[PDB]
Amino acid sequence: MGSQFWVTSQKTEASERCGLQGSYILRVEAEKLTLLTLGAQSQILEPLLFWPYTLLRRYGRDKVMFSFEAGRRCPSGPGTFTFQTSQGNDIFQAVEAAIQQQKAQGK
Amino acid sequence: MGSQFWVTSQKTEASERCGLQGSYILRVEAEKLTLLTLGAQSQILEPLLFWPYTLLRRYGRDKVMFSFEAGRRCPSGPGTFTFQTSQGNDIFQAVEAAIQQQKAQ
């Protein structure tokens, strides 16, 4: 389904609105980034939030984190989402290849 | 559900009938291939057609494409589905494993 990274949410209004707190799995997929958590019942990983690439305003990273700005149409509502992690470059790389691959009509 | 590949529909009687045209994601799952299109409003991939492995006559690949024949029992109907892709092999491999694990019980 796509690469997964264990990340920790650092406070922003959007993450606050979505009641995000603590650590999650961010998964880079073909047309979206998904945020996942252990299901309370299922006790396996399940989606908590979707961010279709075509609905993100911008995204970036550094040696300490990964961050992006969801646009109005994203399910979380508009705003910045930032996650602490030392694999910022890796998530950025995968998001970037998904998008180019996707923009190339995908095939 | 499994690994996904971007694919382009190749004109075929069945794909015409199902109305397929353009790019899609072919997802090879534990018991079927699922053809997903990107959501109009949502901008999220969404199931379009599903082909359970036990309902496929055969399938295969080429450096230029991947293809399979659905049996009469598929929701899409019987016929050939071909998708131009340069990953026909990785897909094919994936289906093998999918199917290998299935009857591996």
Swiss-Prot record, chain B:
Recorded family membership: Belongs to the DOK family. Type A subfamily.
Lineage: Eukaryota, Metazoa, Chordata, Craniata, Vertebrata
Provenance organism: Mus musculus
Effects seen without this gene: No visible phenotype. Mice appear healthy and are fertile.
Annotated protein name in UniProt: Docking protein 1
Domain notes: PTB domain mediates receptor interaction.
Gene that specifies this protein: Dok1
Residue ranges constituting the IRS-type PTB domain according to the UniProt record: 2-105
From-to range in the entire protein, with total length: 152 to 255 of 482
Signal peptide: none
Post-translation changes: Constitutively tyrosine-phosphorylated. Phosphorylated by TEC. Phosphorylated on tyrosine residues by the insulin receptor kinase. Results in the negative regulation of the insulin signaling pathway. Phosphorylated by LYN. Phosphorylated on tyrosine residues by SRMS.
Function of the protein: DOK proteins are enzymatically inert adaptor or scaffolding proteins. They provide a docking platform for the assembly of multimolecular signaling complexes. DOK1 appears to be a negative regulator of the insulin signaling pathway. Modulates integrin activation by competing with talin for the same binding site on ITGB3.
Subunit structure: Interacts with RasGAP, INPP5D/SHIP1 and ABL1. Interacts directly with phosphorylated ITGB3. Interacts with SRMS (via the SH2 and SH3 domains).
Source species, domain of life: Eukaryota
Localization per Swiss-Prot or TrEMBL: Cytoplasm; Nucleus
Tissue specificity remark: Expressed in lung, spleen, skeletal muscle and kidney.
